[PDB]
Amino acid sequence: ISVRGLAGVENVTELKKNFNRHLHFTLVKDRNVATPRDYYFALAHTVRDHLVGRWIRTQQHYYEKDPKRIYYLSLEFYMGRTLQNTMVNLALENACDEATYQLGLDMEELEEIEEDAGLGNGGLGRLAACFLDSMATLGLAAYGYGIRYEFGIFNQKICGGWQMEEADDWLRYGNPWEKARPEFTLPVHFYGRVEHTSQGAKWVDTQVVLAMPYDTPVPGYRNNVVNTMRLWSAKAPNDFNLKDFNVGGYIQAVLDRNLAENISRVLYPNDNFFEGKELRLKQEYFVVAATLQDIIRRFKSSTNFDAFPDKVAIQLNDTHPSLAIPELMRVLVDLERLDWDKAWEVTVKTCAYTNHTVIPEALERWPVHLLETLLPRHLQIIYEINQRFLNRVAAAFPGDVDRLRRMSLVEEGAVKRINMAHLCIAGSHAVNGVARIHSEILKKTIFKDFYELEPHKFQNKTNGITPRRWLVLCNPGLAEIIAERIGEEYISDLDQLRKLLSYVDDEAFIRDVAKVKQENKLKFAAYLEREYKVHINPNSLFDVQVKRIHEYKRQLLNCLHVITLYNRIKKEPNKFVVPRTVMIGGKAAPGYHMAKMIIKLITAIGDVVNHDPVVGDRLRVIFLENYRVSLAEKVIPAADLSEQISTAGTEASGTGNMKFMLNGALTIGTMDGANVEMAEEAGEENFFIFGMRVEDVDRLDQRGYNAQEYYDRIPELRQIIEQLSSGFFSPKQPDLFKDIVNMLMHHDRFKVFADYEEYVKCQERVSALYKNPREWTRMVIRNIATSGKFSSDRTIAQYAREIWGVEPSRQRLPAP
Amino acid sequence: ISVRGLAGVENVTELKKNFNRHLHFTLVKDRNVATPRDYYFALAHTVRDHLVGRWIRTQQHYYEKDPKRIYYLSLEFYMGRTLQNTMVNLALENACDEATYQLGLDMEELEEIEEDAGLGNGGLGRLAACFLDSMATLGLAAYGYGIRYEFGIFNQKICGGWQMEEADDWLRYGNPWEKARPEFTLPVHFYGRVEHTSQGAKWVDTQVVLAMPYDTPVPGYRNNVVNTMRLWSAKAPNDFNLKDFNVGGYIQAVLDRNLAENISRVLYPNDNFFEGKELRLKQEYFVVAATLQDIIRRFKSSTNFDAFPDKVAIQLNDTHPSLAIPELMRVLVDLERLDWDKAWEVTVKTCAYTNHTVIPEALERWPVHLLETLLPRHLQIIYEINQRFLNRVAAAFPGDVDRLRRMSLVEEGAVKRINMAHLCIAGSHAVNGVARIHSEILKKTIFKDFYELEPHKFQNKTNGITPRRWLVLCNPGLAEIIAERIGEEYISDLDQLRKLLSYVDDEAFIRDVAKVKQENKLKFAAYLEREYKVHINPNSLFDVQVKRIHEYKRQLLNCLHVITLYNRIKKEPNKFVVPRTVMIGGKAAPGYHMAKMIIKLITAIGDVVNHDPVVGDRLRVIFLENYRVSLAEKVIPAADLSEQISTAGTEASGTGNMKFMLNGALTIGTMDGANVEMAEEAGEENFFIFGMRVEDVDRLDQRGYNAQEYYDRIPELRQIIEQLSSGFFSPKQPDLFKDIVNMLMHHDRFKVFADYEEYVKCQERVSALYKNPREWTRMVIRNIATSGKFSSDRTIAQYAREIWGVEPSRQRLPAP
């Protein structure tokens, strides 16, 4: 078997008896009534047993040495399953595989029983999960802090072509990885009012909600380091949530506890979109307030807070945890009694902010009346921060009255709002973009005024993904042939993949790389019929676009191409075309009408295309249901063409793109986000770039975008639009897609038509190359061998050195 | 050390390493940061490990042999802590004590960390818990079925003398004893409507709630038998509780899941009182519907249901689970398609009902409109049952039109109601009282008409308590000296206690019995200052009355005596009186105003009495806060006088009385409930009986009860009432007790004044005897030696033989 570790004689024996110990004592079952779900739990408990020893010494280590601690605050941690990832990082995969084999079980079958920890929406949440893995692998004293939702991202179901949402009860059967820590339970306050006394302000008459922490282990890759991810759960106090007497009902008082506990009930399913609901604000303060108390309690052990920034670094994953700034101030000033200026100095030096998008609708602007009611003291502090900040601006740019209002954290208008992004820039010593182009756009556009005031704050930290879960775990076959030639060191040193460049003309390697891709496609094609049922051709080109459904991602542009292909086939049926299986997957936010309309369009196209006899097996349109981390681990290693076609300037970075490049897929996309650095790394000749560049989009906006022009000059495009309009794809409901057509023609913010021509032309070129297996595979090798830069180990090493002030280390912790 | 088992060399070593295994692997802690709570969990997990082996073979045994199964349906299971009880039944107490000692820990300190499983209100719920223990000890294939409330009986707090209720979050830190069984999850239906088709009725358009079971082990006493208690938890389905589309909000849909899950959220805190709330009815159907499906699924394995009653016995603990009758019919007729008559025959033969009270306000009478909306089909079946039953009556008593309406399960009037007690008698083959006198009252009064129709159905099964938890566990010192003389066989054969009669004149025994009682009082007196703080005299007579607060229990009669004692002391300060520490404890239902007023009176008396310098240490009035099972295990073994003074005819049986008799307390009470059989067993000369007999109460009712008469003829009583009225006990609020005085004088349903004179006279006689240690102790021996009849092993053996048709067995199951 592969390099999934050694299957030692003693360890396979030890594993088996421990599996049986748990099946008996833990699951209280006996082989005759054990269900596959019991088997999955016996294994999980057995594997978890192997890292507790290391978990304890790692934490005890940090207590003894007392290094600077890194706190990663995110309202999302898209973790996925954790059994295999733990086996991989512990080098237990083969031993476990062997052991379960002897016990007569199929490890892979059991792995499929684990529920995904879908505590994230997309890119932002998965980034935090990859980062955690990298921080552990680089031996950093890091902690992931978030909310333990009992319901993560909803499960997607397609009914009559429409998306149906359903609760993600991932904790239903229990979570063997987490451990409640009811000793570090903390109180969080809401509402109340502010009393201004003789020696300071006081936040009074507040409603209390308790925060109970749950720790999950985050094992580093083969270095015996196990960091912690602490997730907070909301709990109602038993007193006041019953003790506030004078009629109401005792039963009612108890049932009403599920009101304070609703704070950690469900994840908001919005990807790159802001919804100003009170429940959302509560979740944001809740995770911030509890985390900070925990952070300071740890520090108090390790009272001059002058050394606080020397021992603490808190990274804000977007503006979601932004209340950490005014909350840090509140504690320091109100509770610790530090003077404002000393407190501000400390706050700015320990906080750092990461921006993830530039679209306006994603920007957090909280109505003042909301902050005023829920967090009265914080609003006061935000006004004071704003006051002193604007004084700094006025002093720097005397008389620039317009700049003053542009930079204010307080936005005037219909209803006053607080610009959380402005708050984060003001109270952080570093602000970074997630890709070179996005970072430049921040300085040139969105935060131009802030950049002029303090240029030193702005940086860039191009995103990355973890090679462990995104290669070794999902694509062992590829990881193996690579290791056969250049060794195993690249798993924690992705740059070494460059060494593969010297095998680009190797006849054996070319054949191998092409063989694993073929085996991956056959397995996926099988999985497709197994769990979803309705055949596909594994010899065709696997054209996949998987990410959340968004207008800016242009799944719609992909649709126009699919329809074009179909129409050309119908025109010349007996002409040869490279067969393609185009797969589109992703979830739409429940309230996103347009996004839900696009899912219906995709399934509608498939209904026509997949049943047209003249088309045969040359073209299949499939919608990938319930796209999530565990599903991504299946499609990506099987894809041939990765679609990254967002309008230039809208996708801050993207990470799915990197996942595909690492797994042997060629990329067709626009010069957007990280796409630019990928093409720059692989060489533009090895990339399928097309469409407008940021500049072209701007030029078009200056003159004005008119979709009619394109509709008029391109017959193929016009034909498609008239097909949608006439009900060619929706016979029973001829006007079903009027909203899409209307939008495309009159309010297309992402100029889908503008990139149409260059897009189908470029698609022709990839079909041409696919017709030449050898050359396609050689280009694939050029991509893989040049993907090393996109490892999150590189990203983390940069955050560590350029923002946190800590030195990464690949040193093995002193055994378990 | 005592006979808490052997501390084997190998087993103490084995215990220690397993304690450390769990502390490390399970609690992920290390000795340096382990909290006492961690230590308690390491032990619990270690002790639980010892019975899983037996749990599995016991259940596998019942599958192989396939004996008749006993299902005990109760909405309450007042279990208390379970660590020690498990050690006792497994003979692990000494080994564990030794092992923890060597590990440097105090087992008793750790035991106090366990939370009480307070899933009951009082007598009814504790009975079910004692029964479970006895059914296991007698080797019966029995299952306890109930609801797993996340909030049990509220925790009582006394503020300014008033009772304050607070949520009992007993699952906060987890329950090491239970195990979720997500494989036997079942759906339960609510609402909907009935469709009458060609081949039967159909319950349609129902709302579905899932029932998830949790199993807790019930170990028998040293016989290697471990039965199961299955508790249901309400869970919302992820579909419809989200899938019923067309606007409303996705977040809201998810948050609204806590609506279907509110069914198992909290226990109703009503003791002997009926509240017709919909949530209560839902809990009742929920436990019934899920349990029956589970029962039939088991049977289908073991379709002629003719043999159903031969393999299944379901006991109804009161009328709470009464819907099991119409639900059994529904399944048999609607689903299995059995003819009515065959279905009814089967139902009557498998169901048996237990009555627990005769007070009208405790009777379950559900409004028809409620059953009509929530369970439409059941209402139809109940009407049909009623129809055929009344036809039986009319045929038996031709022309007795009044009897017809008296016996109907349907009560006419303001709003129609269903008399659940009538339903239970009609559909059960046996109906029993809980004490000889209560059982006679059922036949002569309440169910007279039913008794005349089917005399064969009515039986008696005097309650009992388990000698394991109620002697060996709470009073090891007494259990030891008893064992020193007559052996250990009596623990599972309480009748052998009679052998103690021959030591009644033994000088050594008399001295020993008196020594353990003294050690128990010193320990309790210490515990009092430890956890509640405010001293008491251990040389005084411990006068305790602990039970739920009720007007019928007459805590008020106890109060009048306490005030009398105080007044006599004030009159003649320098006269000698036997010192007394009277302790009153118990919870009042939150909506029970009178009951809450009585708690305030008790604390008010103590305020006056405990601080009067002339009184000194001759009299202390203490209110025992948060009375519960674990607290009962502390007070009972320390009591000298047990107060069982309910008005004759109101306390069906009582069980606290038996607990006291077994632990060396003498009893002062009325000829009520089980008191009669206790005095009959010990000899009236060894009992302090007083007051009216049932007959006297009736005579008084015929002529009419006038409290004024007693107030007029007894100066001491009049003085007390004028003290309450004038604010002698409530200075700042002089009229604070007007409701009590008003009630006592004008609407005393329990004639407190009628028993006053005989009560204080009888109290004088116990004080006289207490002055003679030797004789008091000899009378105590007469009580203990004669308490054997009151073991639940006797009660269960009778239910088994006279109702269930199974033979008890004290055979050890083939090792673990």
Ligand SMILES: O=C(O)CCCOc1ccc(NC(=O)NC(=O)c2ccc(Cl)cc2Cl)c(Cl)c1
């Ligand atoms: O056909 C055959 O295999 C031959 C007959 C074998 O029959 C068997 C074998 C095994 C079992 N049962 C358990 O292991 N385990 C449990 O029942 C069990 C499961 C969970 C919990 Cl919390 C507590 C228990 Cl006690 C039972 Cl009930 C019957």
Ligand SMILES: O=C(O)CCCOc1ccc(NC(=O)NC(=O)c2ccc(Cl)cc2Cl)c(Cl)c1
């Ligand atoms: O003064 C002394 O004793 C000498 C210094 C000893 O310092 C120590 C000793 C032990 C520990 N820690 C654990 O055992 N255990 C944990 O931290 C721990 C607890 C629960 C969970 Cl879910 C996961 C972990 Cl990793 C730590 Cl953090 C520090």
Ligand SMILES: *Cc1c(COP(=O)(O)O)cnc(C)c1O
């Ligand atoms: C990597 C990943 C994403 C992010 O994909 P992009 O194409 O950058 O939007 C979203 N969801 C899941 C399941 C992922 O694995």
Ligand SMILES: *Cc1c(COP(=O)(O)O)cnc(C)c1O
């Ligand atoms: C035994 C017991 C009861 C029942 O006591 P009675 O005096 O029969 O009402 C109530 N509560 C608890 C805690 C018990 O242990």
